Amino acid sequence: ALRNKAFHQLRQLFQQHTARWQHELPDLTKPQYAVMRAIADKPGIEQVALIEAAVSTKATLAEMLARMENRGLVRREHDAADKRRRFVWLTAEGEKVLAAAIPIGDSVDEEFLGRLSAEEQELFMQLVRKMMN
Amino acid sequence: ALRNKAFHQLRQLFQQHTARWQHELPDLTKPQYAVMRAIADKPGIEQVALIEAAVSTKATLAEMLARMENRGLVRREHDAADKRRRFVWLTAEGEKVLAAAIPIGDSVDEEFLGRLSAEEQELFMQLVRKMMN
């Protein structure tokens, strides 16, 4: 049965967590949230570097960041040499939105991680990383 | 950092596995694949029951199954009483497509699960289920 497939149960969990995230933060997706935290950690980060936080393609990030700056959450500047290269900052509003979302996302994570001891959480992470090499 | 968030690393893994799936099976997504296996296990399954395999909403499943029968992969029949209620079978082609995809999907799963011992696989599953209650 599908319940016996590790990666099926994985999509079940990922979707349950995503669905809770959608209910609590309907206007800030997990990829948007992660991108914004990467920007807050490294203001002026090069736009291309943000695909790691976004776990997306260059195209999906382009569409994402365009939507985000149209919503006044981020601003961008270009390289005078190569205007494709772009740098990303949070706007004042973006910082406010991010500040409010962090404890919300943390608590959504906790709805699930809270069902595990500390040793089990650390060990769930070791397994995920081991499967990614 | 985001790498220290269990559910961020989880999306990293899920997307890596999804990206491999997309490369090997570009015409059969994981939700489509899971739905088809649920149909093959229970021919004539009620369409509503398939949201569990699809890990989706009723609407996403509707769009999915419509696309799948337009591609000749599944067929559907209606309840003479309540024609919203529908039953789903695989077509001959669908069975052929599913037969070919199973070993492909299994081997994609193995690219990741293969990096874990049997005890670690079973234990990754116990953790995922424990976080879903």
UniProtKB/Swiss-Prot annotation, chains A, B:
Annotated Gene Ontology MF terms? DNA binding; DNA-binding transcription factor activity
Domain HTH marR-type: from-to ranges: 3-133
Q: Induction: what does the entry report?
A: Expression is modulated by temperature, growth phase, salt and pH.
Indicate the residues that the entry says bind DNA: 47-70
Keywords associated with the record = DNA-binding, Transcription, Transcription regulation, Virulence
Entries under Pfam families matching the protein:
MarR (PF01047)
Determine if Transcription is one of this entry's keywords.
yes
State the protein's purpose: Involved in the temperature-dependent positive control of flagellum-driven swimming motility and cellular aggregation. Regulates fliC expression by directly interacting with fliC promoter.
Q: What is this protein called?
A: Transcriptional regulator HosA
Species, as recorded: Escherichia coli O127:H6 (strain E2348/69 / EPEC)
> In the UniProt record, what gene is named as encoding this protein?
hosA
